[PDB]
From Swiss-Prot, chain A:
Its main location: mitochondrion. High expression in liver and pancreas. Expression is significantly down-regulated in hepatocellular carcinoma (HCC) patients. Residues 1-101 form the HIT domain. It comes from Homo sapiens (Human). It catalyses: adenosine 5'-phosphoramidate + H2O = AMP + NH4(+). The chain holds residues 63 to 163 of 163 of the full protein. The gene is HINT2. This is Adenosine 5'-monophosphoramidase HINT2. It comes from the Eukaryota.
Amino acid sequence: SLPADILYEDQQCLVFRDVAPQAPVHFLVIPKKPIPRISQAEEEDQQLLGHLLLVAKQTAKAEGLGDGYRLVINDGKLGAQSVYHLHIHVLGGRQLQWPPG
Amino acid sequence: APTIFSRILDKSLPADILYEDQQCLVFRDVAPQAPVHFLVIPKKPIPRISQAEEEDQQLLGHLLLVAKQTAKAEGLGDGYRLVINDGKLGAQSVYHLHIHVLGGRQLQWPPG
Ligand SMILES: CN1N=C(N)c2cn([C@@H]3O[C@H](COP(=O)(O)O)[C@@H](O)[C@H]3O)c3ncnc1c23
Ligand SMILES: [Cl-]
């Protein structure tokens, strides 16, 4: 991964490309605060969590996902969570299927 | 009224409601793709996530916290998945913003 694979950063979060992409466009939004799982977020995280979704949405627009995309958050083993730090997946650039896994 | 979710919100169409407050409503999906599958929707009728604005930041965070609390109450302690579909390629079909919460079975990868 190269520094340009960081698509966006601010005081609250980072956005970077997934090096194992499951779609033509596939990136990751994380908080700088190490919330390990969404099930362990608390009430104080409310603004931060809202901020992550807006950043996901803005980055999707900036990456050309105007025809549609999917946001995914995985929790625990059953969610297939692969790293114990909160990630929002953004996938686009192809037809997403249903069910979502 | 933009979608059938307007009928669930105004209670003219009876749904299996799990949680409600002034900013949102939670109910079971009528075509579940997992043993537990419910939807978290705002009462404010944002049609899709791509059309949310910065003024919606507090509401969005609230929807996620409500998803996580309801997951806990539904017994999804071994894990689950949260999904938001936008537009045609996202496979969105009801044009009222909502978070899918799926649990009770191993979810696969990729996520569709
Ligand atoms: C009463 N009623 N009527 C529907 N047509 C109806 C559709 N849905 C679900 O709404 C979801 C829409 O998700 P997207 O396809 O991502 O928009 C699907 O999972 C549908 O199964 C519902 N969930 C609860 N109650 C429902 C419905
Ligand atoms: Cl993950």
